[PDB]
Amino acid sequence: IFRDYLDHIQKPIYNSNSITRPMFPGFEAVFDCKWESTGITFKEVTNEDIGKFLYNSSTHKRTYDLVSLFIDKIISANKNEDENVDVWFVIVPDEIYKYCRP
């Protein structure tokens, strides 16, 4: 989904009424910067692992475990991988948002 959305992003994007909101002419057009789907350093989070933590009765423990699972991989990629990444996009599923809030 992220790859598809970015592929959409380079191309111009159109809303219903351009008078209210100016049309989006594309990332490389307005910011004149290269933001392509090539070069994305990807670290996977398997469905089983994210499902093990999610189905917990205690909100605080499940939240801490879910955060730990992501942050450990992020730190490992930052300190033990040659690639340099400007930003770290953290795509989280919707069931977590539903069931990891107070």
Place this chain on the structure above:
Amino acid sequence: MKELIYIEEPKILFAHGQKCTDARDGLALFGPLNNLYGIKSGVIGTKQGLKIFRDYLDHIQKPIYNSNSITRPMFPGFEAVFDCKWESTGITFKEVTNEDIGKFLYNSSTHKRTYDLVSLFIDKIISANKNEDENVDVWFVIVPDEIYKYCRPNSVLPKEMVQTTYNYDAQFHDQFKARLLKHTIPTQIFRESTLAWRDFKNAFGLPIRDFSKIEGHLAWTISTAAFYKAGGKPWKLSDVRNGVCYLGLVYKKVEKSKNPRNACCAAQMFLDNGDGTVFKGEVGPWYNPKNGQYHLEPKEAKALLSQSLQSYKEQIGEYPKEVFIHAKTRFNHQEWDAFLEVTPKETNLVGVTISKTKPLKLYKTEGDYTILRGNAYVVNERSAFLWTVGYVPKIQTALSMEVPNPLFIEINKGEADIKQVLKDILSLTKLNYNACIFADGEPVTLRFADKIGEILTASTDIKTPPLAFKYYI
């Protein structure tokens, strides 16, 4: 009249699946593998030193030439070789006033003055990393020459200019790269002489570090280091077999704590699912008591090898089928019994020792030129001599200056066929990312492990250091 075998020169892979024996020539024509859009560069230093960095960056923007192109290839320009943008515009500059550097430098205590000089730079680097919107890939630390002359061990400050911490080494570079480990900030230190040297001259008037003929290779060795530190993959190996992790141990001395404690450090090279090579550090530093033991006690050996096997299992799925544990020192049975227990049945443990001490020096009968590189004298199925330093026709000269010294490669433990052991070490001498040279005099594992050990023994407060080389070389 003893037989002497010759091993084919290794070929390293470049972009578009193309192979080339040389690194410089292959890079200058095919470019690096990965598309690193641009190098956002940050610089620290005085105003007098910033102009020199700007001038050198402008220089390497344009092509530069050596005295003879055959012995040292020409440099087509940074964007020409690396197809990536690195301009003098967009550098984030942070100031180091001359009064600040002269206040601390002229101190009687070498440890105190070097600690202060490292602190002055590191505070500003951390503050820029944490408190500024600008993103910088690499922090080029321009240091003057006075800091170079008077901020290392055994450096005597002259009595005339002495105007006025002991847990850290007097070495500026080691302490500097050690204390930045927690923040994971890729940095590279630059002498002002390594920069546009023509300003710095001796009494005779010629530059002290005259680099007239070696400008092109200087640009090659600076550009490649900058590209690697930014997250680039200039080249890789191609002939390395699947399922072969290597791992390289080296022992360094620690002076701060009573008992040298002989810190042992490792660098691990292997393959990844696919075709890309992974060459990182395997750093769990295991300190070894006794003044000169250099043999690692069973618990730490088990921990080291378990960590090395786990870093392979997590990235490939299953354990390596055959590893070549290299080392500068011979293996006692105490270590090997510990190693054997950790590994499963399928793994084939091999313990190899590489050294240069014994003086075997092959002189050809006629000619002002040395032996070919790749020549090997096999003593027996367990021991051999490999001339990884010597003549190669491509670079028009021998890598050495005098007659070279080979590497005594012996299979202390495991079984291993000596031909394959001689076939991988010579290829292993090709992955030197700190310098863009045709070949390296020793395998890079025993070299980059030495480097990371020289960095990790400068700070006693280090904890869980990063495993990436860009923070070290």
Place this chain on the structure above:
Amino acid sequence: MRNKIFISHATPDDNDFTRWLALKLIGLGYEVWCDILFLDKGVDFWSNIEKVIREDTCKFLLVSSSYSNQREGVLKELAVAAKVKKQLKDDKFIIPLAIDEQLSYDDINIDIVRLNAIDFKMSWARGLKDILEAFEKQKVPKEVADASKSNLLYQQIFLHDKSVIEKEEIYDSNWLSILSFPEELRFHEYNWMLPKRFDVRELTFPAVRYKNYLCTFAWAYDFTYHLPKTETYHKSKTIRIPTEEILSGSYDSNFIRNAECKRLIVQLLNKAFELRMKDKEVQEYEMSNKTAYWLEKGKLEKDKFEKTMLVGKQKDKNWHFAISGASKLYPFPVLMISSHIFFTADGKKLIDSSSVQHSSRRRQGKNWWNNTWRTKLLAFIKYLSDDDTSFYLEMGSEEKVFVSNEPVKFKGNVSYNI
């Protein structure tokens, strides 16, 4: 059909730019013709280029530099290119490429002054991008991009003149082979006969203490002078062993283990070597661990053995070649020799500053290549000899160690040429 791209340039000066641009364009899929690309030359080439510029060239690229601006061959190629431009009625044919910062646009050749030139002065990558865009716009013939073509052309043309070739070569090492040893290693129980607080380094023949056994190849009563008490020793007390068994590795027991029995042959031969060097009256410098043996100024006829100089002059410093020897028995029974250069102020007294000695040694070795190391080493070891084929280390009144005077030779199947 015209589908070749001609790159004219000044041949002996613009090799780098022409090479880089051609190897880039061929990899990009563009046909390239140039004089440096084709390997070998003949009388026909002067004709060949002409017909190409008239029959196969679709675009003409002129490397503009202070050299190629007024080069006669470049000028002739420019003239024929301009005239084929006229005949094709295609104005965008000659595409100049300016690569010199010192050659301003106001000093270009007359055929090029009115023609726009792609700027290579600042960035070669920008110039190459401009070239690609212009060639795409003008619909120049092109094939699919394939860097393998560039790699193959690099292999057949350029790493091509300097390649691995198979031919036998023989090399001279720094190992002196040991021809023979004394038959039996002797373990004499001197015990109280030899005073305990005594040093064996002053003994006439080499001998090392181990337990209460003096170990040496020398005869029982050779140490009578230094040890007057040894006249009343009994020769049946010796533990003589067939040393050849030790070299094979057959012998081992509780009395001695072969690994620590091989060391008693290595210290022994080392002391024999230093004793022999004392016999040859060559003086010594103390190293940090070893000792180096060098020779005075005047002992050799005109300070040179054979025809090769061993002691020479450098400003006020007399430099002397020296060797360091050590017996090794693991690969074969051999003696390894290493070379050094040491400097003196008057030819007799060594300069005491280690840093100055190291710096001056580096200065001298700056210009010492293979025929300066091997030749001096072989000359010194031949001067060390006792006959034409070998020398001997004094191991006793009758025991000697025979070591060859020529270094071990190996056989290489691959070599090269200058």
Place this chain on the structure above:
DNA sequence: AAAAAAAAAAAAAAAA
């Protein structure tokens, strides 16, 4: 307090 047989830490120059 020695020896040989193996270890590493540091400085100096010079060419790549």
Place this chain on the structure above:
RNA sequence: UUUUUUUUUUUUUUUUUU
């Protein structure tokens, strides 16, 4: 410390014997 190479200084430990 852009490097790399070749040396020169120390220092130190183990195995063994007294």
